[PDB]
DNA sequence: TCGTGCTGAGTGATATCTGCTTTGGGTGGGTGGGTGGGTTGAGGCAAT
DNA sequence: GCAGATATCACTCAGCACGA
């Protein structure tokens, strides 16, 4: 039902692995094939997945590695294009500012009505095409990512997709060095640069 | 799709006893209702969301005997650690035998069984219908906050966050302060303001509410 | 130059007649009623 | 007793040839 949209999942950890196996094909082939009780057909599921998970313990412990704190099979975490890590550290200033921000309810932002039109126009008309400068340094970036060691071809494809997506934002038909630099910058700083 | 107990309490207070006996499905799906007032199901044929704006009151007891304060709270009941965190107020009620306490308890239940009213005459119990009218009138009102009380709330939240920096050693400290605690303090303060029928929340309401969040963990975590 | 009585033809209204059930199935019901009848088996999916 | 499909009989009209 989310063909062309963005699927949303709240509690990914609290899900039996039997159901999670379905998502293996969605994120890889963008299609689902069913063959049972005389029905043999494939339904397109060209949708984006946005899932969230919570740590095994009451909080996240920095000491242990990522594969232990969040659950989920290690291989599954590699499929996701970006895997963020947001933690609620305790500080005398961050907490103060957050409290002042969540209590005012009782730096301009574009109206949502115009933003939806913006994204729709960008998604329909623009179609970026990679350039030679992009490839010359994308090979470098991927090989460097693999050298420091989890890092597989899926990461390079994610870099390609992110570089293409960022160019879409600025309404350009060519992906420049800056956009791919931003993509790689985002990827390293998501898991977090210890 | 047939809704369960939670949906029948929409726009009301659901009433749950034996909270321990929930199965896995409810153990996991009660988080949705507690966080976001809606139940979402995407099973075989139904991909809709049930609207359930119901507050939850729950209770549980040891299966066999009495509580053991020395042992962790999770060591006597099956509820997971995550579930107990979401509750705004958590109360641990204890029954410690004692001659003096039981004497008065028996005398009070006894006076009730004799005349169907309170023994003490210091106060007259409020009539039921009048109390319901007052509750409705209070729920009609909608108060608001201000910067002056906001400063007090934020300072109190800062103190609460700092305090938990040392209490994290105990493994049963699921009541560790989080922004949810700040929002709960705000909610309780607004409740007290509603009872006063006023519109502007004052320092009194916030200080009283902070006492009910404190006396609910201190007396029920230290004992 | 023409007027009218006789005839075949065709509808209109009315006479008898058959029929008044009918039917498998739950968006036809059970105040329509069982002498009007309805007698599976594999495969998929939630609960666990 | 009631509606519908069907066939029966009786009555009246336009043409025709002759006589006025």
């Amino acid at each position: 039902l989310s063909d062309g949209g963005v699927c949303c999942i709240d509690e990914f950890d609290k899900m039996s692995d039997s159901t999670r196996s379905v998502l293996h094909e969605v994120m890889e082939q963008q299609t689902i094939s069913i063959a049972k009780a005389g029905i043999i057909t494939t339904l397109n599921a060209r949708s984006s997945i946005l899932a969230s998970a919570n740590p095994i313990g009451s909080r996240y412990n920095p000491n242990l590695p990522v594969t232990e704190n969040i659950d989920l099979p290690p291989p599954l975490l590699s499929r996701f294009d970006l895997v963020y890590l947001v933690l609620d550290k305790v500080d005398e200033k961050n907490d103060r500012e957050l409290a002042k921000h969540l209590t005012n309810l009782y730096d301009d932002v574009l109206p949502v009505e115009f933003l939806t039109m913006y994204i729709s126009y960008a998604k329909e008309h623009i179609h970026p095409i990679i350039t030679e400068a992009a490839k010359t340094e994308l090979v470098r970036a991927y090989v460097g990512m693999r050298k420091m060691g989890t890092a597989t071809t899926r990461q390079l494809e994610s870099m390609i997709r992110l570089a293409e997506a960022h160019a879409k934002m600025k309404l350009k038909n060519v992906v420049e060095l800056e956009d791919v630099q931003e993509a790689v910058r985002l990827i390293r700083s998501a898991i977090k640069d210890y | 799709l047939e809704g369960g107990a939670l949906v029948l309490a929409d726009n009301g207070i659901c009433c749950i006893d034996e909270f321990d006996k929930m199965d896995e499905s409810d153990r996991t799906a009660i988080h949705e209702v507690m966080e976001q007032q809606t139940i979402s199901i995407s099973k075989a044929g139904i991909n809709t969301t049930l609207n359930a704006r119901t507050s939850i009151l729950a209770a549980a007891n040891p299966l066999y005997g009495r509580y053991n304060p020395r042992l962790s709270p999770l060591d006597n009941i099956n509820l997971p650690a995550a579930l107990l965190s979401r509750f705004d107020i958590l109360f641990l009620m204890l029954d410690i035998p004692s001659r003096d306490d039981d004497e008065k308890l028996a005398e009070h239940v006894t006076y009730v069984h004799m005349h169907n009213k309170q023994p003490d005459l210091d106060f007259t119990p409020v009539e039921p219908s009048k109390m319901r009218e007052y509750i409705a009138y209070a729920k009609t009102k909608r108060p608001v906050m201000s910067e002056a009380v906001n400063d007090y709330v934020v300072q109190a939240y800062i103190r609460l966050r700092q305090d938990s920096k040392r209490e994290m050693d105990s493994k049963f400290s699921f009541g560790q302060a989080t922004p949810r605690t700040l929002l709960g303090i705000i909610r309780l303060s607004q409740a007290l303001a509603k009872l006063r029928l006023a519109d502007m929340v004052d320092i009194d309401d916030v200080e009283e509410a902070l006492r009910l969040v404190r006396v609910s963990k201190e007396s029920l975590y230290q004992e």
Side-chain angles (χ1 to χ4, degrees), chain A residues 19-55:
Chain A
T19 86
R20 259 205 306 271
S21 86
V22 151
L23 296 199
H24 280 319
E25 281 166 340
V26 152
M27 311 185 108
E28 162 190 16
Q29 283 261 263
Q30 293 306 29
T31 323
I32 299 197
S33 297
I34 36 177
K36 54 217 187 92
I39 273 299
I40 163 172
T41 180
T42 85
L43 302 105
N44 292 0
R46 324 178 308 274
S47 61
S48 325
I49 297 208
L50 178 83
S52 86
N54 283 7

Side-chain angles (χ1 to χ4, degrees), chain A residues 97-106 108-182:
Chain A
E97 214 189 17
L98 169 55
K100 269 295 212 184
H101 177 106
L102 206 68
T103 204
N104 293 354
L105 266 66
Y106 312 99
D108 87 8
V109 278
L110 290 177
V112 302
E113 286 90 33
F114 157 100
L115 171 63
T116 65
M117 269 166 27
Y118 196 118
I119 71 171
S120 278
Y121 170 69
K123 199 164 176 183
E124 213 60 345
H125 292 67
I126 273 46
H127 279 345
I129 310 202
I130 307 299
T131 76
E132 268 291 358
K135 163 184 174 82
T136 50
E137 66 84 45
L138 266 183
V139 171
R140 187 288 295 289
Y142 174 49
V143 74
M145 272 189 50
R146 276 219 103 169
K147 268 175 192 180
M148 304 182 285
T150 310
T152 36
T153 62
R154 184 86 78 199
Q155 263 50 70
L156 165 57
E157 296 193 299
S158 188
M159 260 184 299
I160 272 282
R161 292 214 280 275
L162 260 179
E164 282 166 351
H166 174 214
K168 252 189 196 178
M169 191 205 59
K170 277 133 73 165
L171 301 153
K172 282 149 59 184
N173 302 119
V174 307
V175 179
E176 215 166 283
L177 162 70
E178 285 73 352
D179 298 350
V180 57
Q181 217 196 13
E182 189 75 51

Side-chain angles (χ1 to χ4, degrees), chain A residues 59 88-103, chain B residues 149-165 175-186 189 206 210 213 217:
Chain A
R59 294 171 71 279
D88 61 359
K89 284 312 311 313
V90 202
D91 196 343
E92 271 146 0
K93 74 192 51 53
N94 183 62
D95 285 5
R96 158 173 286 286
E97 214 189 17
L98 169 55
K100 269 295 212 184
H101 177 106
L102 206 68
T103 204
Chain B
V149 300
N150 263 347
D151 310 346
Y152 200 80
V153 176
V154 298
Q155 303 154 260
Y157 178 59
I158 280 186
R159 294 171 233 154
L160 261 183
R161 289 302 299 282
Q162 269 333 279
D163 289 345
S164 199
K165 228 178 190 154
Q176 177 236 358
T178 44
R180 307 192 70 93
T181 284
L182 159 61
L183 255 54
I185 287 159
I186 296 172
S189 309
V206 295
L210 286 155
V213 59
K217 55 182 71 180

